[PDB]
Structure 1
Amino acid sequence: KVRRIALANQKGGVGKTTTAINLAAYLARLGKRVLLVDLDPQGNATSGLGVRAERGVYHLLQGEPLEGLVHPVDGFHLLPATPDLVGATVELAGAPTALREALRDEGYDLVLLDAPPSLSPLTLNALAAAEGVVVPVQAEYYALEGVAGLLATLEEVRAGLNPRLRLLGILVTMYDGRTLLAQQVEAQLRAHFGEKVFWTVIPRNVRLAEAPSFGKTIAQHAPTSPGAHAYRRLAEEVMARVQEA
């Protein structure tokens, strides 16, 4: 039974936050009760949703109620990141299951954990608290190694911290349609990882890059753009995999 899904990988700039935000947008639209949790001190998901918070995840880990920390956004709830969050890293280091205990998210159908571009204690807290992992990757050649490494990390976390942890899927993001290289990398990703790679692929599209600067999801910003259609179908695909898991 997959409820909590971590968005994670080694690198930054690979589409974790974009996928977190827009999956939430379309899963809410599918009639699910969704909580988006921003675990990045840089607070990109919080910012990309137009929200300025004084209280967030930091304050959840200290004991303050979930209900009075969340912000209603585009038909879902955001548990924001605040500029304080950085000061939990040292405590969470040595306490990988802290988020798992602090998350009393019984009311929500699906919980999206937007992890930072590290394997920091916050990323590890994400992995330890989740049942599913979506791994965004560019259709670029380094992705095969990056993926294999992440998969080995997942295996290690499953063996030592969280036996519920499973790869939901590898998601190809920022697929550049102007070039044949993306085709070739996608084909190799599928050749090597098979059914683990989602069939839905997220196009590189200006409207997706634009959306966070406006503090809006792609469903609010550009609902008929190539990225909107893709994330809507991805939400359907994610639900199919959750249902079959």
Structure 2
Amino acid sequence: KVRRIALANQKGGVGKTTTAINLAAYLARLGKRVLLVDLAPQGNATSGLGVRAERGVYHLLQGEPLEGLVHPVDGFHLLPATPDLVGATVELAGAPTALREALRDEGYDLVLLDAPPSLSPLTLNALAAAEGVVVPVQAEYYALEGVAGLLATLEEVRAGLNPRLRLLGILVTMYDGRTLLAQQVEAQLRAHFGEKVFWTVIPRNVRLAEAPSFGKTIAQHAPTSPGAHAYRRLAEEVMARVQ
């Protein structure tokens, strides 16, 4: 069964963090105990939740107990990114299972891993520790162009590094239905990957970008906005696919 879900895509700015935060927010509202782990050196998920920490996931890898590293936020827990992740990108080379072996998260129902836009050791650790992968794909050309290669890479990972890793689903994000490009991109994704693509599409709406500046999830910042409804529906879909 799927417990750990990685939000991954080496393409930058396709909604990995926004999805990790808001998926956690609505999964928590479904009564699930959720842990959000920020593995990006940039630490956007952490900053977007109003947290500034000196200890986080980096220290978990150094033997520190999980319980004393988490921060309570909007109904779930966050294992924060710290400036140490910069060096961790190098230190973890050759150690892709480090996170998997340090994640004593049995107390949680679901664990979300937010990865940086790369195939660095941090992203590899996320993929090696996860059971399912949600791939956010921005409704534009560059993001669409990288899917084929991205899916092949996930297969390489499942080939030996993590045999139980599976694609939970492809999520169309930052979708503006008024543009032909967004329509054409969603169409190509559903034509080639069919059921792999989530039904729910995340629409482009500025409240989603505003939320982080207040350290709030979309459920806290604009509970009735298009993005809120979209992520609420996604949480339901995710649970359906996990079951």
Common topology (TM > 0.5): yes
Q: Matched residues in 1 for 2:215 and 2:142: separation?
A: 31
Shift, 1:141, TM fit? 2.3
Q: Matched residues in 2 for 1:34 and 1:7: separation?
A: 14
Give the match's secondary structure for 2:127.
helix
Q: Matched residues in 2 for 1:71 and 1:160: separation?
A: 34
Q: Matched residues in 1 for 2:115 and 2:145: separation?
A: 20
* Consecutive unaligned residues in structure 2, runs of 5 or more: none
Aligned residues: 243
After superposition, give the CA deviation of every residue in 1:171-227 in whole Å (9 maximum; x if it has no partner). Answer: 000001331221121111100111110010000001001011111000000000000
Give the match's secondary structure for 2:68.
coil
Give the match's secondary structure for 2:35.
strand
Shift, 1:67, TM fit? 0.3
Q: Matched residues in 2 for 1:27 and 1:99: separation?
A: 23
Give the match's secondary structure for 1:112.
strand
Shift, 1:142, TM fit? 2.8
Q: Matched residues in 1 for 2:142 and 2:20: separation?
A: 22
Q: Matched residues in 1 for 2:78 and 2:15: separation?
A: 18
Native 8 Å contact 2:10 2:118 kept in 1: yes
Give the match's secondary structure for 1:203.
coil
Alignment of 1:1-245 (within 5 A): 1-243=1-243
Give the match's secondary structure for 1:113.
strand
Q: Matched residues in 1 for 2:85 and 2:189: separation?
A: 35
Q: TM-score, normalised by structure 2?
A: 0.98
Shift, 1:11, TM fit? 1.1
Q: Matched residues in 2 for 1:143 and 1:207: separation?
A: 22
Native 8 Å contact 2:14 2:143 kept in 1: no
After superposition, give the CA deviation of every residue in 1:136-157 in whole Å (9 maximum; x if it has no partner). Answer: 0111123333111110110000
* Consecutive unaligned residues in structure 1, runs of 5 or more: none
Native 8 Å contact 2:11 2:143 kept in 1: no
**Deviates most, 118-127 or 136-145:** 136-145
Q: Matched residues in 2 for 1:106 and 1:115: separation?
A: 21
**Deviates most, 142-151 or 1-10:** 142-151
Give the match's secondary structure for 1:209.
helix
Q: Percent identity?
A: 100
Shift, 1:39, TM fit? 0.1
Give the match's secondary structure for 1:67.
helix
Q: Matched residues in 2 for 1:217 and 1:113: separation?
A: 16
Shift, 1:160, TM fit? 1.6
Shift, 1:103, TM fit? 0.4
Native 8 Å contact 2:138 2:144 kept in 1: no
Native 8 Å contact 2:35 2:77 kept in 1: yes
Q: TM-score, normalised by structure 1?
A: 0.98
Give the match's secondary structure for 1:30.
coil
**Deviates most, 181-190 or 205-214:** 181-190
Shift, 1:85, TM fit? 1.5
**Deviates most, 140-149 or 3-12:** 140-149
Native 8 Å contact 2:37 2:111 kept in 1: yes
Give the match's secondary structure for 1:142.
helix
Q: Matched residues in 2 for 1:92 and 1:50: separation?
A: 27
- Over the residues paired in the alignment, what is the CA RMSD in angstroms? 0.8
